Symmetry: D2
Subunit: 323 residues, 4 copies
């Protein structure tokens, strides 16, 4: 996975969902009066409305990523081997990873509010159901001002400020940021010939500034290439142009089918790519085999409802036969 923030005029939030198998992903709107029952903390009978992509395998909104009606977003990204979920700790707010998105997004408007919430958190090892055990995750949260990373590992729970608004998979966030230091020299412009003033070296291609940028599908490579691509991105401020640029940043680090064998000839690939407009409450997506962007606008629903509002994803190619 790769999650990013972007700002044009509005602020956007989204991610590539990379995996080798697809669990009936759906677009789910959780309206305000859908009661959240939590295993070990107080219930939220009334809360902020949420829209995101969820696993359509349960009668409860099992979000992979989502935004709320106040412009706060959250995404869980694979952290296999690194994530560590705890036993119940008296005096903490004991929240399972499966509940975590609803817990934050239901009651926080801003990253600053979530930071307050997160001081008393303990992420506990409680499965949604017996058939649907917990996945090892870490999290990106963002709003119109900033982003944070939440990692629960063997060492404990850490919350990081995220200066680049990017996240991928392993290893821990401190290492990802540090590694950026190695790529200081990368540029959008052609370099001078620093190698020697005694010889002429030819500028035989455009794009030479970026030489050294990693193009493989591993976690750290993708972090570096998505961060470069995001921070050097230019687009106009119109909504369609801004989401176009955003999906181009996500494309830059998508996983093509065939390229990442995870064993037994199964392939990790970019099942879907999302872009959420935090001001407008619009969840945009593309899927591996549907290039057209599809938009679901949470504000078009009745957010006073008490039941999930579920949209199947348009997963097959929508061609414009012009002619």
């Amino acid at each position: 996975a790769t999650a990013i923030t972007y700002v044009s005029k509005d602020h956007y939030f989204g991610r590539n969902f990379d995996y080798e198998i697809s669990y009936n992903e759906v677009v789910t709107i959780t309206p305000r009066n859908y009661k959240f029952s939590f295993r070990e903390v107080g219930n939220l009978d009334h809360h902020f409305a949420i829209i995101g992509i969820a696993a359509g395998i349960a009668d409860y909104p099992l979000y992979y990523d989502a935004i709320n009606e106040k412009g706060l977003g959250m995404a869980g990204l694979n952290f296999s081997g690194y994530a560590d979920y705890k036993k119940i700790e008296e005096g903490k707010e004991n929240v399972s990873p499966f509940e975590f998105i609803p817990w934050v997004l239901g009651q926080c408007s801003t990253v600053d509010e979530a930071k307050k919430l997160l001081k008393n958190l303990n992420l506990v090892n409680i499965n949604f159901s017996d058939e649907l055990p917990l996945s090892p995750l870490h999290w990106l949260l963002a709003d119109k001002e900033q982003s944070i990373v939440v990692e629960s590992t063997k060492e404990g729970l850490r919350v990081f400020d995220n200066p680049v608004g990017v996240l991928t998979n392993n290893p821990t966030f401190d290492y990802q940021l540090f590694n950026l230091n190695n790529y200081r020299v990368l540029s959008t412009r052609t370099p001078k010939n620093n190698f020697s003033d005694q010889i002429e070296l030819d500028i035989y291609s455009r794009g030479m500034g970026g030489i050294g940028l990693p193009g493989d599908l591993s976690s750290v490579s993708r972090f570096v290439k998505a961060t470069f691509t995001k921070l050097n991105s230019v687009s106009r401020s119109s909504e369609y142009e801004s989401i176009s640029q955003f999906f181009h940043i996500l494309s830059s680090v998508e996983q093509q089918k065939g390229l990442c064998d995870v064993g037994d000839e199964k392939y990790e690939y970019t099942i879907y790519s999302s872009c959420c407009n935090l001001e407008k409450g619009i969840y945009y997506y593309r899927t591996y085999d549907n290039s057209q962007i599809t938009a679901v606008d949470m504000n078009k629903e009745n957010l006073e409802k008490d039941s999930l509002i579920v949209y199947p994803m348009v997963e097959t190619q929508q061609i414009n036969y012009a002619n």
Copy 2:
């Protein structure tokens, strides 16, 4: 600035068009009886029908790339500083670069027939007009059996068999192919720990087999990355799944706006991407700010016509509002 071939069940041909300015690109169908008048060779009054993208700045089809009704495709790619066009040579077929796609695709059904034609070619330095002078180019041609590269440089005219079905920009094709030798180790599978059997190295990420693949936007890096991506691609044989994979290979080496500064704060970016089904005569495309695939089927036109059939490109984002 990347052209490729791909085979699933049907065979496909297409390209990214990367440049810093967009000159009224249109989809042009040249029907069979549109007379081709050539500056220094015999005219083609009747010829094979052609579909491609052309510069919509002239009343002659100035193709950037195209396919004909017999399943032969051809594309011109920037080769600045490398291309050399010649004086007229008595005893050669003297064809200008602006005429070259009509010349080959009007009369050849296969790459083998083009190879016969190319033995007598001399690419000549004659402009379409003073207002529209020649661009430095090289070409990829491909059919359902194979692909070749055509380069006219200071050293002369060379035609290469293309064992990977990819082409980018500079330098010459022999160097591009040679450079692939440096990447033998790259894999879709996790490597063994060859580094040392005396220590344990952790597999902390998927996709580690690709470490080393270059992710910058320069010519040679994109060549390597598109080749690796193409050759290791997997998809089902259905038309929509096949073209989806094709566009994903082109996306792997597209150029995002902002990342390649060419001066005067102008940026080289991927203005459009095409995929052509050689068996079906369908030209599919996506543009920088329209992610939906748009299809133009040459076979829906009257190919016995006399005049060019010109379609504007769908350039703004075609969004599926699903609620």
Copy 3:
């Protein structure tokens, strides 16, 4: 700097000393009855004899690296920006970095003994003298069984087991080890063509397995290249052949003059390279402008002495005119 361990039959320990200026380095033997007066801990009036390289600028042995007569070695390596020395802490053994080598090597025979010693350590910010303030360091310690790294940073004091027997400069040791994970694929043997079974790639050179090994002079690059070079090293077990291999591992990551500008046209370069035989008590060195190995054997001195025994370094080239 780069410090390493190596084993053939005997166990060796040594380092490159890389800096931009040379402080009258000398080979100093500290015999058993040279009283060590410590600023804040108990004195060592009698202790193990030590041989190493020291700054010949003071009447006290200011070791850059040394071994003792029991086969325990220690080296300090630049850690600028990372090292943090503390205030005096009641209940700790408060030892200044300038005293640290004498403190450990004077009283420990083995790394296990030093680990015991190090549990109560606090490295304190006390200068040797007013003219000779403390340098930011971290440390490698080794004996015939194992090696450890000692880092005192803002976070605190950490002692790491060192599975590869290498150290360089920044950043912290955990990051260096982690980074090795990225180089799992590197090999002494030619790789298979994993890139594609559809094309022939030519083995045009020997040594292709190692492609990806970094060759720059930065700290992390040197760590990776010295670790690869050490762990894949082969030599015979004879003393001269074993030290030859050891100096070849150090050469692999030396800093040539001119290549590392540190500002004002001053250059960080490998002032000297050492190799110490832990069993025999022999300190071998080469300097930048003397390629011949020079050997100082501590066991040839009277180790019951009470005064430093000081050898100037042979710093100019010793040529054998044969023829």
Copy 4:
């Protein structure tokens, strides 16, 4: 397997000899009146005196590299799979590779005189003997003014001006030079943060300007690394300081035993390194297991002699026991 030129005040020429087996390498001085009998060209009964390293397996001087008394040097380097030696061609000077160093150095004082000679050359496939068949090679020649490369391949005989004064193994020299273009950015100074002005990247190490330089033992990587090292070298003008720097450039790309497995657990390693002072006629060398520099001065022999003057190499470690 790396040859270089270097200038301080005097001019120097020399090489690493990298191979997996050592065949009685000796230092051979060919005096002026040692008759050269050539297989297919006129004999040189009187010629310039030559000093170099030769295979001590024949009563003819089979040089790996050498210089003559007029300050012209020449070296043959492995070019396996690339070299092509020819049938005898009437009207050419037909010279076998085993004769080629005598042929040029016996009669030419300068690279310009060699260029005149080489216009009529045809390198012929004639073995010294059945027991000692030809090796595939290419050559670097150099004097106090310039250097050139000579390659005989399937395509023919080519002579290139060498703008960097380096040569390694495969592939052809035009590709080696071209590849340098990819390294324009590399610097001896710390880079600016070009990556993004929106974030702070820490300069955690010296030598970050070189990041990207390749550190593996393959041909092309060593070419790049030796070129960067050579061109950015600094030293004083004194003979001992100059040769010290020279040997440091060769050390930057030497091959440590164990790191290049060529099969049958045989290893390609740097058997010897030479540096020749062209003005003085001195051959200096180091060997894998002798780090001390050994000098052989051709001018101390009687150059009017008739017979080869042969010195065994000092191959075991010459240690300075300083106590």
